[PDB]
Design a binder for these strands. Structure first.
Ligand SMILES: [Mg+2]
Ligand SMILES: [Mg+2]
Length: 88
RNA sequence: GGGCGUUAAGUUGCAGGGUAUAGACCCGAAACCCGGUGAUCUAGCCAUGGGCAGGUUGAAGGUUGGGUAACACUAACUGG
């Protein structure tokens, strides 16, 4: 999965600090990063269905976090998806 | 005894009757063989040139939008 240096880095970018490791914004950024990396993986390994079910979980899971955030603080939500360049 | 012979003059011209070989009384095939002449018609090919008013249909491809985690997909447009 994501590297410990690349994980720690995002938590810095989207968290209240280094240890704000479970905030919604952070969780959704980390999922985003791993989804986009894996875009590369399945480009070459289309037949890796098992791994894909794991990717699909990261997606459905990010979707639930984004909805919760939207419900609880739409302003925090808009920033977060624009910043992550999502929704189109 | 029997067969063929012995006891009939022939031959050379000339005219004629027939026959033979020859086109052989005249005309007439379809064809077979040999050597030439023809692709200015037409068949196919080769080189080099020319021609197809006007009106339709609107493939692939491309752009944008929506869409998808990403592809799929989908609309309009463009394209010809
Ligand atoms: Mg492992
Ligand atoms: Mg005599």
């Amino acid at each position: 999965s994501l590297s410990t240096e690349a994980t720690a880095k995002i938590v810095s970018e989207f968290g209240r600090d280094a240890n704000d490791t479970g905030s919604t914004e952070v969780q959704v950024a980390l999922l985003t990063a791993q989804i986009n990396h894996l875009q590369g993986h399945f480009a070459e390994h289309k037949k890796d269905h098992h791994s894909r079910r794991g990717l699909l979980r990261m997606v459905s899971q990010r979707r639930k976090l984004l909805d919760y955030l939207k419900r609880k603080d739409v302003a925090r939500y808009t920033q977060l998806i624009e910043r992550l360049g999502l929704r189109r």
